[PDB]
Each structure stands twice: as C-alpha cells, then as structure tokens.
Amino acid sequence: KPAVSVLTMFRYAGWLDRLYMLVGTLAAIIHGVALPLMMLIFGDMTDSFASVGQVSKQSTQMSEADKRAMFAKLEEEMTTYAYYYTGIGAGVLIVAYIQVSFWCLAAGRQIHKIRQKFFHAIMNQEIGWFDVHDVGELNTRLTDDVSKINEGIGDKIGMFFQAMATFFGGFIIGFTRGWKLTLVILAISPVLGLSAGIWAKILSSFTDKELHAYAKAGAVAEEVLAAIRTVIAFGGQKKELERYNNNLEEAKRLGIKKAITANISMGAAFLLIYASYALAFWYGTSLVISKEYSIGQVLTVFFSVLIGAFSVGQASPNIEAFANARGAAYEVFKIIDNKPSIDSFSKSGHKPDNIQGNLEFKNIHFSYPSRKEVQILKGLNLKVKSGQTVALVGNSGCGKSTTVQLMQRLYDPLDGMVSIDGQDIRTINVRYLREIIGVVSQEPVLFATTIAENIRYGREDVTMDEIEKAVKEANAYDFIMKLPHQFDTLVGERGAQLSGGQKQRIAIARALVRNPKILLLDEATSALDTESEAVVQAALDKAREGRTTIVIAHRLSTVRNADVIAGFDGGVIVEQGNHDELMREKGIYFKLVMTQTPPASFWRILKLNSTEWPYFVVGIFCAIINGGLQPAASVIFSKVVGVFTNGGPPETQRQNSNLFSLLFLILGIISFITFFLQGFTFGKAGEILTKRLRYMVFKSMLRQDVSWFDDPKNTTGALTTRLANDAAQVKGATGSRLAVIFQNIANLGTGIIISLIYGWQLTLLLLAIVPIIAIAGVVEMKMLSGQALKDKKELEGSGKIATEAIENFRTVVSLTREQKFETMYAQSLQIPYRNAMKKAHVFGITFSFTQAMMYFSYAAAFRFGAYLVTQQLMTFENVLLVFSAIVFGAMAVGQVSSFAPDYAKATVSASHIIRIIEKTPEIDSYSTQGLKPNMLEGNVQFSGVVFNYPTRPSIPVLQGLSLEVKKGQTLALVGSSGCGKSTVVQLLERFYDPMAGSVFLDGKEIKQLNVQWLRAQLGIVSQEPILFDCSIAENIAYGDNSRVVSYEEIVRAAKEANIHQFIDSLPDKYNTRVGDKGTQLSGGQKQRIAIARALVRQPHILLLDEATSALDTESEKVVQEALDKAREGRTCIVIAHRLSTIQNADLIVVIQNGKVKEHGTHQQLLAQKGIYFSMVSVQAGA
Ligand SMILES: Brc1ccc(Oc2c(Br)cc(Br)cc2Br)c(Br)c1
C-alpha cells in the first residue's frame, strides 16, 4: 500500500543513467512501432498479388501476355517490399539491443549504488533503532527488496514503452487506414473480457469446493491416522477404509460435475472468442464488396488493431513490476534518508587529548526502548576516580549493565548527564568516544577471519608485534601457539569452535590493542568455567591499573580488590564504599555475600489406469479430430482471403464469402462439441483413478504396523499431505496435458501435410527456419537461467558478510570499525557490479538476435514465396495458408514445453505412490492366516523378553523380562519410569514382535497366532481416549467389529462404565455427536466411554495403561470406581500410577531396567523393604 515518488526512486540516476533511459525508451518505442508497420506492408503485397490475381483470371484468352506485365509488376513490387522487410529486420536488430542493454545498464549502475547506500544506512543507525526491529527481516529486506527494485527499473520499462508503442502505433494504423472496423473490433471487446470474467468467478468458487470436498475426506484420514493405534487396536481397519471410500465417492461425483461445467466453460469461451473475430472479419468482407476498402487493407487494420489490443495485456506485467519496485523502494529509502541523532559516522564534536579518566553520572533517568512500560533507572549518582576501578553489584534488573550502555553513548539518557573528564559525553565525537573506551562483554564474539584479524579489529593499523604483545599481555599467547596455523587460525560459528575463556582473552587482547583510556567489563567472568575463569581474570587484572574501569559481574571474587563497590536497588544507588565498609553497613552488599556464601519409466501407474480401456480412446480420437479441425480454420481464412484475392469476376465473390463464413461457424460448433468431449472424458477418467489411488494407498497405509507410524519421517500431517498431493499430481499427468499434447501433434501433423502438399520447396524451407528460431529461443532461456543462478551465488557472498555485520551489530559498533564492513561489502559487490555490466550486453545480443531471426525469417517467407515460387505457377492463396498452418502448428507445440514440469512433478509424486502400496509390514493385520483358538480362558506368559523400539535402538527398555498372570487375576505392574510399564501392553497387543524371547497367552506363542484374533480378546484402555466424530453409541459399538452391536448391548456397557448418567442427560442421548465437532465434554466421560467400548468386546483381558493419568478430584474416584468393577472378572494388567488403588491387586510386579526386580502381593512386597515400599512411601507422604 505505501509507495514512492517516481523521481526519488531514480535519485541515483545522473548524467549517463538519465541518457541510457532516454535512448533506451526511444529505441524501445521504435522497436514497438516496427511490428504494425511490418503488417502494413503485408497489405500492400496482397494488393500487388490482388491486382495480378484479378487480371490473370480476367484473361482466359492470352497466356504469354500474362507472363510479361504480371511478372514485371511482381518483381518491382516484391523486391521493393522484400527490400523493406530486410530493412525492418536490421532496424529491430539495432533497437532491440539498445532497448535491453541500456536499461539493464542503468539498472545495474543504480542497484550497485542502492546496495552501498543502503548497507551504509544500516550501519549508521543508533542502537535504540535496532532494539525495536528484527535484524533478520532487515537483512532479508536487503537482498530481496533491492532485487525487486532492480526488476522494476530494469529492461521491463523498455518492454513497457515497446508495448505502448505497439498499442499506440497499433490503433493509429488501425484508425487511419479505416475508422469503421476499429469501432467494430472494440464493440466485440466487452464480450471477450466478459467471457474470461466468468472464469475468474468459476475458478475461484470451484477451487474452494474441491478444497472443501476432499477436506471432508482428509478430515476422516486425519482422525484415523492420528488415532491409528486405536483403530489398529480394535481392528476398525475395514470400516475406516469404508468410511474414507464413501467420502471418495462424493469427491468423485463433485469432481465429475466440475469437469462437466468447466469444459462447457472453455468450449463456450473460445467459441465466443472465435465467433467475435469472424464477425469482425466477415463485416470486413461486407465493406469490400461495397468498394470501400481493398482486400489488402482489411488485413492491415485487422492485424494492427488486434496486435495493439493484445499489446495492452503484454504491457500489464511491466506496470506491476514497476509498481512493486516502487513499493519495495519505500522501506529502503526510508532507511537511507533517516538521519540519526548519534551517527557515529559524523565527523563532529571534540576529541580530547590527555584524557585522565574521571567519570561521573549525574541524576540519570533512563528507560530502554520498551519506554513507558518500564523505567529501569530512577535517578542516579555515581563518580569513579581516575585510575580507580569501581564495581557495580545488584540483585536483579541489571541496571548495572545499563551504565555500560550509557557510557559508550549507545543511548542517550532521558534526563541527566554522563560525564567523561569534565565534559558532557555528547560534546565528544561518537567514534573517538568509543576508541577511548575498551569493552569486554559477557558473551565474547569473534568474526570469521584469522586471530590476527579479530585482533586487527581493535585497530586497523597494527603489526604482528603488537598482536603478539596484546595476546601475551592477556596471557592468550601460550594457548594459540600450540594451536596449529599460529595467528593464521580460523574462528567463527563455522569451524574451530574454541573454549569460552579462550574466546574471551582474544576479546581482551582485541580490546587491549585499542589502548583505551576507559575500560568497561560487563559480566565477562560470568557464565564461564571455574578454572579458565582464573586464567581470564588474571588478564583482566593485567588489563587494568593503567586505566579507569567500571566492572559489572555476579562474581564477588573479583570485587574485593576494587577501590570502590556500588550497589543498586530499584535503579537507585544505595550503598558505596570499600568492601569492609559495606560489610559494616550490613545492607544489600552484605546480604548478597551471605546468600552466595527418482524419475524413471513407471508404466504400471498407466496399467492401473488401464481399468478404463475406453474413455481415453473416446478422448484421444476426439482430440485428434480437434487437432485436425484446428488448421481448417486457417485453411478457411486462407481461402476467404484466397478466392477473394484470386477473385477475377466480382459477382461470384459475394456469394462464396457467405458460404465460407457459414462453414467456419459450423466448424466452430463441431469444435465445441469435440472439445466438450476430450475434457469430460479425461476429467472423468482422472477423478475415478483419483479414488482408486487414494483407496489403495489408504488401504495399504492401514496395513503397516505400529513400527511404521512411529517413524519421525511419517507423521499424521505428512501422511495426509503425501495422500493428497500424489493422487492429484498423477491426475494431471494423465489429464489435460495429454489431451492437449495429442491435440497439438495432430494440429501440426494435419497442418504440415496440407502445407507440404500445398507448397513445393516452400514448406521444406520453413522447416529449416522454424526449428532454428525455436532452438535459438531455448538457448536464450538457458543462458538466462545460468546468469541468474551465477549472480545469486556471488551476491550471497556479499549478503553473507552483511549478515555477519548486522546481527553481530552491537559488538562492532562498540568496536567502531563500521567503515571496515562498509568497505568489505563494497569490495564484495564490485564483482556482481562488473558482472551486471556484462549482463546488459548479453541480454541485448540474445534478445536482438531472436527478434532479428524472426523478421529475417519472414523476409525469407515472402522472397521465396514470390520470385522463384511465383515466377513458377504456384499461387499466393497457398502461401498465406502455409504461414497460418505452420506458424500456429508450431505455437501449439509451444504448449508441450509448458506442460513438461507437470509430467516430472507427477512422476516424482508417482514414484512415491507406487512404493507406498507395495511396502509390506512385518506384522500384517490383513493376513487371514493364524490359529484362531477355540478355548476361552486367558493366561499371559512373558518369558525372557528383550525389546528395543525400532526408532531408537540405543537405550533398551525391556531386557530379560518375564511375567505370568492367571485367569481372573489382576497383574499390577510398577516401574521406576518409562514405557517398560507400557511396552508390556504393546507387546501383548502385538504392536511389535520382541527381538529375543517370546510372549504367550494360552500357551501358544502370539507370534505364530493370528494377529487380528489376538487383538480381539484385548480390552485396551489408554490414558488419552481418542473418540471419533460420531454417535457415542458408535464410539461404544467400535469395541466390537465384524458385527453390529445391539442398543441394549451398548447400553449394558454404558451401564458398566458408569457413563450412563450423561447418556440419558443429553437431549440426543446415545445419538449425540462427540469429537469436539458436535459436542465437547471433559476427559472422565471420554474415558468411561473407552471403558464402555472396551467391555463391549467382552474381553478376557483388560489392559489399563495409566487410565487415571489426566484426571482430577472426584473424577478419579468415579473412573477408578468403574475400572475396579471392570476387572476382577477378567484377566487384567494395570500399570496405573496410583499405587493406593493398586493395593488390591493379585500380583504386583516392579520393573527395573527391563528386568523384573521385585514381585509379590502388596503386603508381601510391603513386608520386603525396597523399591516397591519406596514407591509406596514416596507418594503416600507427599
Ligand atoms: Br492467417 C496468418 C498468420 C500469420 C501470418 O504471418 C505472421 C507471422 Br509468420 C508472424 C507474425 Br508475429 C505475424 C504474422 Br500475420 C500470416 Br502472413 C497469415
């Protein structure tokens, strides 16, 4: 919404840049004017053949006489015109170079200036300016927005004035050579803009419907794939498939309805568009039979107007490119023009010599850019004498740290003054102020250069002698010399990550080369290892006694030798003096001392599409007809101008022109009929395999075991995304692109035959010319992508040192040396700048070449069409036909290159969708194999079970585990922590087979047992019961599948689970909808319902996995009251974390490190004293 003045945007254009744009926009207009003139001469050549075409047929008496005056007219005329086109092609060769080159030159020259000015402005901003913005957005603003500015001021402007030249020059020749047809062509323009407007309404409305249509099926898939361990547990894998299949049926029916309406839309759209043209051209014929215009002029105005009319649409993108470049330049120039109060690049203020270093703070009130929300200093008074070292202590707020911020004049105070020596700090130069102040901060930062270079960021003029003394005087010498490469080592976020105390001494040595008169040490010893602390602390004490120093730290070890100590309380200075005095004061300081002591040939996807042997053959056959039907309009247009250039006697002409125009409209309605079919046939054929694919995928997905859905590569969202994209992409490959690619090869094929059999030696010429300009048009775009990628590679090296500069900013400004990054960024941009200059000559040559190879090509189309061919017996009416036929047949092949990525994007999406079906699990629930035992009673053997989760085969959970529980008993299971309690339930449910050992139930190994039958006698109840969006009657009936459960049977379960209090209380009762879609209710109810569906199954084994996990107060007392009633009649395994409710259990088992450690009844394990009795006495007292 915000934008920029048009002159301010080019503020960096001066002298030559202003000329480049003037000469560029001049030749751009000349380039645009050239095309409607190119068509103007196309009318005069018709009149040349027309005068001869009328007189040649008018004879029917003399033949040799027509070999004289006729050919004489032709050679003087045709050579005059052919001489003119060759001049036009030489003209466009020059102006197209001038157009693109100069604008890209002015762009590159300015964008170099933008960059430098804009990075200059970033470094000039005071700190308070950064505290209110994000530096990451700013850096992306540096590389992206400057690119948008370059796109707007570039060669797009020349293309704009080129298009307006074609537009103006278009209707000028349109108006002057005839004012009627133009008003007639503009009269049909609202109809064309109205038919395309029906598309903006149908698309935007129907694209939402399908995104709502599958959103109903994708919603089913998401609550399933999220609740997968529950559907696997109860074996609803046939229902959840069935229910996803039922939504696919509706999405198919909505997809075929969209296919019907959208194809009616296209066909009716074109048929209105092509009828609009034909009426404007038929009523061009109605004006020639009346002797107002010539057959050549009708062509001249008919093309020049449509060229200029379409030139409007070809200029619209360049308008938006210029407008976005303006809007992008607002926030950029806003930074450049913004002037700070502090600068730090300003050459102003005093520069005192012989600085003794007497500092005082007077009545300083201050607040960080959070402003009126918080005021961190409520007045202040503090002096520090020259040579002394004051220490600042404080409990919180870190107002200690604020004084270091103010001393560097990072911010100015609200009220008060900070005074170095006697002068106010605001009188001294900002840069010289920071050169007389050395800073060592908590987190040391080192730039991505050598050790010497980081030390060289203290002062630019320095020799390895002074680096050596600095690191040796900050005892960091002995510790780099052992490190290889000497001073020439590397440091940064990338490579040679060092010790913190090691990085701090390099910072101290960096601050030591600064030979400052003032020293600020903030938290430097804090957040650092204890032993290297003393090593750095020796350097700090050696960094002083030649300087006055303010130090802030939470280490009360460094503070004793400070000449004076100062404490803060609420921004107010309170205590000050020597250590002994503050201890006698017994205040804040004393109080803190005591406290701290694969693209491949995939045919099978089409073999699955072979389910419909018809529907393609209908569409293919119907597409090839539409392909062969499409040049016939060019054949008609050829003969409409042909027989009426080849007229002769004029009485018969008016009667044939009506016959052809009638044929055209019968030929368009039969084109509507054949294109309503080819779209419907593939549309239906695509929507039906969309179901088959999504059906078979969602079927195969429910087939893998829990080992596959635990994969971090496979989550619920990534699976629904993989489910939706892969099915829609393969639909597009077999969809419109294939009908169109066969329509177009039939378009050119039926066009090449007519042209080849109409023009001898002629078609063979064009087939030598057209492929060259097409390949020359492709090699340009490859060179375009190469130059684009290369410039991206070498400007990110500039933005990389700009990234280091701006998000490490508060350190560099503390070290000054902004001019250093200022220059480094300039040297980095000098390569893309001198590269951007070559870009202009490259784009200019390539563009001018492809334009000349088009004009020169069409000079050879006529010079050969006339002369050698027309001195022979071949005719003009066919030359016009071969042009339209070949040129449209080629431009229809241009759609093949546009649909190319739709194939690769689908094959890659197909690549995954064939793999996802064929992948088979280790534990397949679909296998009908298995024993299906007949005996009822239930035991459970775990014997020497060692288990590791397939996702994390590092720390074992089960190793040598052994259990046994009799029928009708409750097996309590206690653990120190982890899923060692829960993995038992997962292995009995056979979510996994164990690595070693085995688990049995009725004496039979479950590994050889039926997987589905096994899970059918299991009453799993988890800690967060997931309930699908449906009637609670079904959420309860979900516990028994392969059969519909009675109402009074799901009532009995609701009676058991003690949930029946709601189930009558609701207005809907058992038919209420739950799932946070129709109704919401708390967890205790969700849980009871899970108990209800658990014992609908009438299991012989309950599995209670921390059922009272998320639950509170009386809700625990009633759910336990339901669980305690559910067991005791069944085999039970309960791992609930309430050991008070576990006391009444037939056998309690303590799990240690995967091994069974301690088992027995409650009082038996309570008589023993160990883990269980520690587990029961850790929560009874707490
Ligand atoms: Br119908 C018909 C279509 C294209 C024809 O030649 C061209 C060609 Br070839 C290129 C361009 Br741009 C414009 C025209 Br008009 C002719 Br002549 C007749």
Author numbering: 30 to 626, 689 to 1273
Share the article's original sentences.
The multidrug transporter P-glycoprotein (Pgp)/ABCB1/MDR1 plays an important role in multidrug resistance (MDR) and detoxification owing to its ability to efflux an unusually large and chemically diverse set of substrates. P-glycoprotein (Pgp), a member of the ATP-binding cassette (ABC) superfamily, is one of the most promiscuous drug transporters in nature and is capable of binding and expelling a very large number of substrates from the cell. The structures highlight a high concentration of aromatic residues in the transmembrane α-helices that form the DBP, many of which are directly engaged in contacts with ligands. The binding mode of the environmental pollutant BDE-100 in the DBP of Pgp was also previously captured by XRC and it was shown to be a potent inhibitor of verapamil-stimulated ATPase activity of the transporter.
